[PDB]
Scaffold this active site. Sequence first.
Site, short mmCIF file in Angstrom:
data_model
loop_
_atom_site.label_atom_id
_atom_site.label_comp_id
_atom_site.label_asym_id
_atom_site.label_seq_id
_atom_site.Cartn_x
_atom_site.Cartn_y
_atom_site.Cartn_z
N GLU A 134 -3.56 3.92 -1.08
CA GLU A 134 -2.82 3.04 -1.75
C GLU A 134 -2.90 1.47 -1.02
O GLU A 134 -3.31 0.42 -1.14
CB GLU A 134 -1.68 3.10 -2.35
CG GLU A 134 -2.09 3.90 -3.47
CD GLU A 134 -0.83 5.22 -2.97
OE1 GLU A 134 -1.70 5.94 -1.90
OE2 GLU A 134 -0.43 5.86 -3.39
N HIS B 271 -0.86 5.29 3.94
CA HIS B 271 -1.28 6.49 2.80
C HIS B 271 -2.77 5.49 2.15
O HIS B 271 -2.85 4.11 2.05
CB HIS B 271 -0.19 5.93 1.92
CG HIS B 271 1.20 6.71 1.78
ND1 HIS B 271 2.17 7.18 1.37
CD2 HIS B 271 1.08 7.99 3.43
CE1 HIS B 271 2.69 8.27 1.93
NE2 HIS B 271 2.05 8.00 2.93
N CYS C 108 3.78 7.42 -3.98
CA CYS C 108 5.70 7.31 -3.82
C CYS C 108 5.88 6.18 -4.24
O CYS C 108 5.25 4.48 -3.93
CB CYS C 108 5.22 7.42 -2.06
SG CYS C 108 4.83 6.11 -1.14
N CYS D 192 4.23 3.08 -1.77
CA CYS D 192 3.18 2.67 -2.05
C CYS D 192 3.12 1.88 -3.53
O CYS D 192 2.70 0.55 -4.07
CB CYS D 192 2.52 3.77 -2.49
SG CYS D 192 1.72 4.22 -1.23
ZN LIG Z 1 2.36 6.02 -0.50
#
Ligand SMILES: [Zn+2]
Lengths: 156, 156
Positions: free
Chosen positions: B58, B56, B86, B89
Site C-alpha cells: 500500500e 508494504h 495494517c 497503511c
Molecule cells: Zn501495511
Amino acid sequence: SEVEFSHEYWMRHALTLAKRAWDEREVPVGAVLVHNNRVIGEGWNRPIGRHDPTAHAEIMALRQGGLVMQNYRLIDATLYVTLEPCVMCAGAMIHSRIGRVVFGARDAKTGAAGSLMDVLHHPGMNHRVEITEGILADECAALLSDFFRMRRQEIK
Amino acid sequence: SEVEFSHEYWMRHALTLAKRAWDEREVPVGAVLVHNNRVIGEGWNRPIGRHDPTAHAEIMALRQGGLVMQNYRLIDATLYVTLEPCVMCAGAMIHSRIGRVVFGARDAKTGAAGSLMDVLHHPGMNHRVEITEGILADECAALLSDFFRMRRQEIK
Ligand SMILES: [Zn+2]
Ligand SMILES: [Zn+2]
C-alpha cells in the site's frame, strides 16, 4: 541543564530537524533514530515537497535506519520526534520493532500514542514500543505555534 | 466473468503484484492505486529485501501515486490491496485522502479495517475512506495460505 545523550539532548537534535521542515514550509516536526547513542536515522516532515502522504519525520528516520542497519527490524532503537506520532507512524514503529518512542508535544487531535487513540499499547500488537512523553514539549509546541501563525501571516 | 474496470478486474491485477512479492519470498500482498480507471500506483510487499519496515504494498502504491499526481493528496483514488491493511497503511490512506480502499482477504490478527481495530472509520479522523471488503477474498487467502505453508516447509 541538558546532559549528553539524555532525552532532552536527543530531542534538541530532533528540533534542529524540525526547523529544516520549517524552512521548507512544512509543519515543523523533526525526528532522530538512535541506537546505542549513535544516530542511525534522521527525518523531518515533508509531504508537500515530496508529493508523498507518507513523508512524516518518523517514516523518514525509520527508512534511513533500516538502510543504515541493513535490517528492516530496528531492535532496541529509540525514536525521538518533536510531536506525538500519528496512526501511520505509530504503526510503522510497531513493524520496525523499535524499543521506545520519545515524543515532545502532544497532538491533541490526531496523536496515536494516547491523544486521539492508543495504537502502541493496544493489546493485539505483536510488539510493545515503550513511550516517553513530553520531552521539551514547550519548545516543540512553540515551534509549531510559531508556524501556524507565521503561516496565517501569509493568507492575504 | 470479470468486466473491465470492475473491482474484481482491479483486484486480479493486484493479485499479479502479490505474486511478485511471492517470488521475492515476501509475504504475498499486492496493491494497485486507480484514478479515473487508470493505474497511478502499484506496489507489492517487500520490507525484508528493501531493509524498510514501511515497505508494504500500500505504501509503495501511494508513494507512486503521489509522484504521478504531483500532490500528496490523492483525492477520489481507489486503492485495491489483496489483504486487509495494517494500522500503518490504514493511517497512510487517511493522510492521502483517497476515496476508497478495496481489499481481499481479512487479516484477523492485525487488520486495521475492522479486524484488530478500525482506524479507517474511527470518528476522530479528519477524512473518511470508504471500504469495500472481500473482493476475490478466497483467492487472496489461498495465496497467503499457500505461502505460509510453503514457507513452513522450507525450514530444513
Ligand atoms: Zn501495511
Ligand atoms: Zn505520522
